[PDB]
Enzyme design. Structure first.
Site, PDB file in Angstrom:
ATOM      1  N   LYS A   5      38.228  20.223  -0.927  1.00 19.90           N
ATOM      2  CA  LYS A   5      37.294  20.999  -1.742  1.00 19.90           C
ATOM      3  C   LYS A   5      35.969  21.167  -1.006  1.00 19.90           C
ATOM      4  CE  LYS A   5      35.713  16.867  -4.171  1.00 19.90           C
ATOM      5  NZ  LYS A   5      35.849  16.040  -5.410  1.00 19.90           N
ATOM      6  N   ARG A  24      34.011  11.815 -18.031  1.00 21.36           N
ATOM      7  CA  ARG A  24      33.790  13.215 -17.743  1.00 21.36           C
ATOM      8  C   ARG A  24      34.996  13.984 -18.259  1.00 21.36           C
ATOM      9  NH1 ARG A  24      29.268  13.513 -14.243  1.00 21.36           N
ATOM     10  NH2 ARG A  24      28.762  11.479 -13.308  1.00 21.36           N
ATOM     11  N   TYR A  33       1.302  22.274  13.096  1.00 24.50           N
ATOM     12  CA  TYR A  33       0.076  21.701  12.533  1.00 24.50           C
ATOM     13  C   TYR A  33       0.378  20.676  11.438  1.00 24.50           C
ATOM     14  CZ  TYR A  33      -4.898  21.572  11.198  1.00 24.50           C
ATOM     15  OH  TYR A  33      -6.194  21.175  10.940  1.00 24.50           O
ATOM     16  N   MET A  76      13.069  26.297   8.079  1.00 21.60           N
ATOM     17  CA  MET A  76      14.252  26.913   7.512  1.00 21.60           C
ATOM     18  C   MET A  76      15.334  27.179   8.543  1.00 21.60           C
ATOM     19  SD  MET A  76      14.273  30.029   4.622  1.00 21.60           S
ATOM     20  CE  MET A  76      15.473  31.314   5.233  1.00 21.60           C
TER      21      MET A  76
END
Ligand SMILES: [Cl-]
Ligand SMILES: [Cl-]
Ligand SMILES: [Cl-]
Ligand SMILES: [Cl-]
Lengths: 369, 372
Positions: free
Chosen positions: A37, A131, A264, A310
């Site tokens: 999965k 569940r 920075y 990113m």
């Protein structure tokens, strides 16, 4: 080509080795049901499953019907168990694609049956997880699920909550689940029923409770040769080899002066003149941001410097010879004598191995090794 | 069908509102460059970009050539800028798909030129970020890049480190980044060079440095109606509206006796007889596992349902003890609005100890995407 920027390397020899180790560790009558999965835990669903079927694995578990449909499209002809709820409105597809559906409770089985399509199923028993699953108390409902006209129950299973722990609380709870599960089977037999294929164990089910003998073991993490946490203390200690590695190519090198930073950041100030390498991988590719930790280049540790962005990040290669554009950095994997394992990375990102692997970005090319 | 399990809902009306709001804050000749990298910050690159082009956006930025090529396959005809490295070995694809390439440094520029393909480019200048870009020292290398036979330089740009911060030190660094950038431009001009299109600003560059005058603004988070955190007072306060919602349908309701747990994690022990709804969404779908154990809630029937126990790979559990209108098939809103309630992407990102950019760009590929 797929190897220009960032990519995943999957070691099919290691996967093959793992399959054999796992099989050998199982009871002779127990089969490997490979859990594939979420893109095979980020390893690549096409790559892993076609290869698994090719080397003999003949049973798979996916999270959703669309996952299972993908496998069929890939050409997978082995049985496939959908671990989650499938809307009854898609019963025709469960039927058409011969997908085995988890029965999550009596009502659902009733609604599924009502759709009028012949469907293979396994019944999930909730033994404490609370569940999905039929409760152990509702034995008449469990038995009733075996007499539904369109529902062919081929199996019965449960999921252990704390098999990965040797704490007495978790041991007693694990045994309680195992115990109440077999009491369900006893009760069913007492009512004339023949028990279908049984499965109870995931990876740590095998590792910490190998004395169990069922018809399948649902192997996820162990199959991919990794542990959930770094250095766990399992009863079995199998020789499992990591399947996945994560690589990126240096795309630019620059000098920064003493006292300068990258991006920075308040956290990084160069203590000397430094050589920085830029790697085209960031959090969008699934390399966690909160690792804002080193990579391996030339078998050496290059500390990550500045925050992870990113689409890119930076590493300090000041002490490392023969680094140029096109040099391969290892973010997860081996590099000579050095190794960065998946659980190590997950741990420093305050996460578990499962999350780290299953959240590898779709953007990452996958290639064989 | 696509709504059966878990899905993202993309409010195209809200996106269009954002495009208009943003263009309004821009100089007439300044163009919106929609940053659509990482599946358009998780919003779905196909859905978002085709709509953006439909409504008149005529400039896009992506992270990689493969994103750029995908846009072309989606029918995108506008200019596209690849912001990061592209292997010169793929210079043929850059040429064929008419993609504009970022010149990340001099050596790169030369190597791409040597491939022999006519390629459009924007040169990047490093003004303090110290990642990609030509250094401000190496003035001659920059000018030389303007004399490469196969590279047509159509723009020049830089990235600001901290335009999102109005702290003293940060503002100072941003101002020197800007100063350094135009020093380069002046120097280039003096060398007989006519400057191409300029861009310096991302979302906060517009919001916090609106006085800048460039030819593009590269808009990311602002375009999607979310601000990276909450709640900075930017110089401009624009009316931006959230584009993305995250939804999932209840697959089971379970009674939990007082004293019982969920997933046995000592993370949750019911203090009363409870009702639990199971949602078929987990961390593999990009809903961060660190939201586990009450670290967020969802909206069901307009009410808050706290997450109970650990978040799993493909499912999680919420508390609906005080929400009678919950059934199999009920829509849970994990990000978005329901009734008079709202759980915004920035709120969720704060709860996940993250930032909007990461929460959104890491939405799982398994999630279905629906326009609204
Ligand atoms: Cl479950
Ligand atoms: Cl287990
Ligand atoms: Cl950069
Ligand atoms: Cl900015």
């Amino acid at each position: 080509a797929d190897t220009d920027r960032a990519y995943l390397e999957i070691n099919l020899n290691n996967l093959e080795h793992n399959v054999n180790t796992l099989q050998k560790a199982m009871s002779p009558k127990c089969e490997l049901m490979a859990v594939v999965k979420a893109e095979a835990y980020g390893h690549g669903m096409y790559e892993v499953t076609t290869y698994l079927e090719q080397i003999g694995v003949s049973s798979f578990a996916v999270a959703t019907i669309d996952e299972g449909i993908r496998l069929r499209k890939y050409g997978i002809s082995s049985e496939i168990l959908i671990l989650g709820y499938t809307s009854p409105s898609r019963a025709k597809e469960l039927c058409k694609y011969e997908l085995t559906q988890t029965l999550i409770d009596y009502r659902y089985s009733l609604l599924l049956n009502k759709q009028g399509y012949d469907i293979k199923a396994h019944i999930k028993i909730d033994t404490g997880m609370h569940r999905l699953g039929f409760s152990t108390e509702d034995k008449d409902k469990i038995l009733a699920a075996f007499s539904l006209k369109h529902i062919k129950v081929a199996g019965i299973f449960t999921h252990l909550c704390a098999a990965d722990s040797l704490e007495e609380n978790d041991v007693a709870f694990t045994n309680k689940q195992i115990g109440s599960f077999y009491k369900v089977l006893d009760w069913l037999k007492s009512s004339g029923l023949n028990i279908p294929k049984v499965h109870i164990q995931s990876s740590y089910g095998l590792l910490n409770y190998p004395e169990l003998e069922c018809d399948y073991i649902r192997v996820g993490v162990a199959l991919y040769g990794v542990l959930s946490s770094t250095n766990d203390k399992t009863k079995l200690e199998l020789d499992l080899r990591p399947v996945l590695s994560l690589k990126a190519k240096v795309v630019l090198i620059r000098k920064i002066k003493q006292g300068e930073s990258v991006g920075y950041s308040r956290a990084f100030t160069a203590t000397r003149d430094s050589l920085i390498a830029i790697l085209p991988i960031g959090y969008a590719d699934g390399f966690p941001r909160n690792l804002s930790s080193y990579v391996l280049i030339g078998g050496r540790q290059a500390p990550i410097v500045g925050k992870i962005c990113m689409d890119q990040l930076a590493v300090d290669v000041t002490d490392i010879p023969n680094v140029k554009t096109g040099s391969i950095a290892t973010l997860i994997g081996k590099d000579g004598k050095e190794e960065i394992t998946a659980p190590m990375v997950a741990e420093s990102a305050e996460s578990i191995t499962n999350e780290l692997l299953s959240r590898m970005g779709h953007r990452l090319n996958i290639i064989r090794r």
